[PDB]
Design a protein around this ligand. Structure first.
Ligand SMILES: *[C@@H]1O[C@H](CO)[C@@H](O)[C@H](O)[C@H]1NC(C)=O
Ligand SMILES: *[C@@H]1O[C@H](CO)[C@@H](O)[C@H](O)[C@H]1NC(C)=O
Ligand SMILES: *[C@@H]1O[C@H](CO)[C@@H](O)[C@H](O)[C@H]1NC(C)=O
Lengths: 38, 295, 253, 51
């Protein structure tokens, strides 16, 4: 699964998409906690 | 959108708009379609119509996909419209999947190898071979009863399939659909050079390249050993490569399954990304316009 | 998972995650979306969105999962995005069923080779036989045009495929496309006691198993009568069972 | 084939033709002529086209 993830046409694209997804998931609970406060 | 006429593709969008607008029309001047806000309290108005300009378009959209929203009306004169709507949705959905299925099934059945060994029983590619060379001479009297038919058909149309020479044969191939038939060595070499020209099929016959010689001369039987020595060394193989290496054609997907992949599905994801970035754009636009109305 | 290549599956993963997160980050930051909780809400000051990670995450999970979830969107942006999500999942799964139907049909409509003449027309599948096992000899001296061209193909291989040893052609068939035309009895014996192997077609020939005697043998007519008795009885049937299927059946798939 | 039976030619006892006809039958059988003429006299119409 190391090669399966790493070996892809421009896994770079895979990594970029994963980065976007992870970062936005990180964005979420900030507004979650702020809404809970409010 | 291939498995449908684009005519319908636009008619359905305009019919979306039409059904939505007429739905709002029928909802507006409808008495039964006025719910009571604060319902547990008997002291309020009946402004609740479950329908805005937004709601009609929204439900026209969201009813289509088999999820639906909870913005159902309550009047009989409305449900009827909704029923016709969902019936149209069912017909379009049942057509689309079916037609995509028909496409892909035909594609699967589209065997491309040309039988890969016998363009016999195809009778339409108009194969060919170097005129009166070694090939037909084999096909002559070849009683394998498959390659016999090949000879029969090349014999019939012996004006277009028989080609002047190797270069003219391959040029005729480049011209139009013209399968070509000659010695595997030249086949390999020239396809070793013209990379996107295509190798076809395995082997058919096998002959011998040896060395000619004066009759009964001792030279032959003592060059035989040298030939054998060169073979059982291996100089033959690398030497063969050194004149047959040429330029390597980039590989092609033969083994890997023709199961659905991105080369056939991709566009929708980019559709999604474009739509959602457009959506965030108009979202911040609407938020700032909300503020501008307030401020 | 076969009818959809594992080049899209990770794309479902990423696309779902993106749709869910983006639709939430659109929906939370929107001025309309906040709403009054109470049923008989007398214009309170507690309007707020309901959406939580769980609410939107499995909104996407259900929509992708081909089932309407709860929490209808309200704002233009969230509603159009969720519509795009609905559209995406619909088109994907419809395509999915399409391709799987493609496989099932195309497999269902295949036809396995059955006839000796059907193999005659064929070229890739290689005919075979233990040469000089009285079988290919019959092909030499066969008169039927089919059998004639099978013998022609045999001569054409010139022993390149022909084997001299039954079991060896057996393994060749096990491992390659080989026919190895032999006699019926060994066929039945091996097949009933083997895996992956099949009797194919009918019977080309009509050889007979008898008893050899000199011109003068008193037992000739007597034994003709005896064998007609046994075959009338059919004890030979149970004998064939004993030595062909008595091992065939326990070793039968 | 539920059962096995064979059509053979009848003659009284001691007929010299029993053996001379057995050898003839074997040779004609190896000739495959029996096969083709059986096909002919058991040919009939053939299968129509039904797909
Ligand atoms: C191969 O690629 C070249 C591109 O330079 C093109 O001209 C040619 O038509 C292609 N096909 C063949 C069979 O050469
Ligand atoms: C199926 O066909 C392939 C083709 O080469 C062969 O190698 C293999 O032994 C056959 N059987 C199985 C179980 O794969
Ligand atoms: C049949 O093929 C299977 C693989 O598909 C193999 O495991 C098994 O040993 C074979 N049985 C034979 C060749 O009798």
């Amino acid at each position: 699964k190391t090669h399966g993830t790493i070996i892809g046409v421009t896994s770079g694209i895979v990594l970029v998409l994963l980065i976007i997804s992870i970062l936005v998931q990180v964005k979420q609970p900030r507004k979650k906690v702020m809404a809970c406060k409010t | 959108l291939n498995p449908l006429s684009p005519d319908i593709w636009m008619y359905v969008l305009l019919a979306c708009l039409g059904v939505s607008c007429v739905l709002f029309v029928i909802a507006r001047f409808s008495p039964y379609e006025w719910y009571n806000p604060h319902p547990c309290n008997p002291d309020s108005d009946v402004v609740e119509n479950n329908f805005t300009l937004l709601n009609s378009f929204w439900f026209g959209v969201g009813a289509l996909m088999q999820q639906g929203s909870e913005l159902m009306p309550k009047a009989l004169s409305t449900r009827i419209v909704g029923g016709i709507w969902w019936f149209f949705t069912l017909i379009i959905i049942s057509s689309y999947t079916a037609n995509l299925a028909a496409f892909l099934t035909v594609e699967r059945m589209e065997s491309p190898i040309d039988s890969a060994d016998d363009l016999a029983k195809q009778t339409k590619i108009e194969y060919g071979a170097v005129e009166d060379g070694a090939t037909m001479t084999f096909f002559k009297k070849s009683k394998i009863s498959t390659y016999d038919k090949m000879w029969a058909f090349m014999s019939s149309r012996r004006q277009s399939v028989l080609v002047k020479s190797n270069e003219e044969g391959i040029q005729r191939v480049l011209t139009s659909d013209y399968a070509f038939l000659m010695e595997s060595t030249t086949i390999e070499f020239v396809t070793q050079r013209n990379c996107n020209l295509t190798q076809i099929g395995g082997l058919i016959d096998s002959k011998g390249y040896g060395v000619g010689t004066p009759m009964g001369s001792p030279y032959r039987d003592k060059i035989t050993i040298a030939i054998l020595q060169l073979q059982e060394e291996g100089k033959l193989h690398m030497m063969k490569e050194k004149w047959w290496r040429g330029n390597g054609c980039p590989e092609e997907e033969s083994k890997e399954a023709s199961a659905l992949g991105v080369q056939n599905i991709g566009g929708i994801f980019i559709v999604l990304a474009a739509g959602l970035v457009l959506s965030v754009f108009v979202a911040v636009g609407e938020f700032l316009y909300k503020s501008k109305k307030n401020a």
